[PDB]
C-alpha cells in the first residue's frame, strides 16, 4: 500500500540527478508514501541529527548543496508523522530502504519520470518506484536506462496480460 520513490543519477537533469552523477551515487530515496497525507502541526520537529541518520539519502535542494535535511524534513512533515507516529520507526525504515537502494537494482523498479536522450536513443529514468505508474517525459517505443541498467519495458518485471 506504501509507495517507495527514489531519484536516479542523470547528468542530463539539472538538480539532484546531476549531483548524484558527480557524487557517483546511483539511487537516492525520495520518500515512502502511505495513502494518508499529513496536515497540520507535526507531532515532532525532525532535527538534522535525526534526519542525517538516513544514510545515503541526498536532499533535492540546491540550498544544502543536495545533502541534508530539507527533502528529509519535508517527508517527515507530509508523510511521516501522522502515519508512523514516532520518528524512530520512520528513520529506521527510511534508512533500511536507502541501504537496500545503495545495494543496486531493486526487485521492483518502475520508471516515473524520464528524460529522453537523443544521442543514446534511451529513456533515462530520473525517478522510479516499486509499483507501475503513468509515465512522464517518456518516448514510446524507446528502451529505458535506470542509472546505467538497460531495460526493455518501464519496469524490471512484466506487468501486462
Ligand atoms: C506502511 O505505512 C504504514 C504507516 O502508514 C506503516 O505503519 C506504521 O508502522 C509503524 C511501525 O513501523 C507503527 O508505529 C508504531 O505505532 C504504534 C501505535 O499504533 C497504534 O495501533 C495502530 C496500529 O495498528 C495505529 O494505526 C493507531 O493509530 C495506534 O496509534 C506506536 O505505539 C509505536 O511506538 C512504539 O514503538 C516505537 C519503536 O518501537 C517507539 O519509538 C514508541 O515510543 C512506542 O513504544 C510506533 O509509532 C504505526 O502504528 C503504523 N501506522 C499505521 C497507520 O499503520 C507500515 O508499517 C508501512 N509498511 C511498509 C511495509 O512500508
Ligand atoms: C554532463 O552535463 C554537464 C552539464 O550539462 C555537461 O556540461 C555541459 O556541457 C558542455 C561540455 O563541457 C559545456 O558546454 C560548453 O559551454 C560553453 C559555454 O558555457 C561553450 O562555450 C562551449 O562551446 C565550446 O566547446 C565545444 C567542445 O566540444 C566546441 O566544439 C565549441 O564549438 C566551443 O568552442 C561548450 O558548448 C556546458 O557549459 C555544460 N553545461 C552546463 C549547463 O553546465 C558535461 O558535458 C557532461 N559531463 C559528462 C561527464 O558527461
Ligand atoms: C531490505 O531488503 C531485505 C531483503 O529483501 C528485506 O529484509 C528481510 O530480512 C531477511 C534477511 O535476513 C530476508 O531474507 C530471508 O528470507 C526468508 C524467507 O522465508 C526468511 O525467513 C529468512 O529470515 C531469510 O534470511 C527477508 O525475505 C526480508 N523480508 C521481506 C518482508 O521481504 C527488507 O524487506 C528490505 N527493507 C526495505 C525497507 O525495503
Ligand atoms: O526527490 C525529488 C524532489 C524533487 N524533485 C523536483 O525537483 C525539481 C524542482 O524544480 C522539480 O521539477 P518536477 O519534475 O515538477 O519535480 C522535480 C525531484 O526530481 N526529486
Ligand atoms: C543506516 O544504515 C547504515 C548502512 O547503510 C548503518 O551503518 C547505519 O548506522 C544505519 N543507521 C541507523 C540504524 O540508525
Ligand atoms: C552504479 O551503477 C553503475 C553503473 O552506472 C555500476 O557499474 C556501479 O557498480 C554502481 N555504483 C554504486 C551503487 O555506487
UniProtKB/Swiss-Prot annotation:
Active-site residue numbers: 74-75, 78-79
**Glycan-carrying positions:** 2, 11, 26, 65, 95, 100, 143
Q: Which domain of life is it from?
A: Viruses
The cysteines covalently paired via disulfide bonds are 38-82, 68-69, 110-155, 114-138
Describe its membrane topology.
Answer: Peripheral membrane protein
Activity control, per UniProt? Inhibited by Zn(2+), which binds the catalytic site.
Site residues, Hydrogen donor to release the cleavage products of E(rns) glycoprotein RNase activity: 30
Subunit architecture:
Homodimer; disulfide-linked.
Q: What does this protein do?
A: Initial binding to target cell probably involves interaction of E(rns) with glycosaminoglycans. Also possesses intrinsic ribonuclease (RNase) activity that can inhibit the production of type I interferon and assist in the development of persistent infections.
Please state what the protein is called.
E(rns) glycoprotein
* UniProt organism field: Bovine viral diarrhea virus (strain CP7)
Its organism's taxonomic lineage begins at: Viruses, Riboviria, Orthornavirae, Kitrinoviricota, Flasuviricetes
- What part of the full protein is here? 271 to 431 of 3907
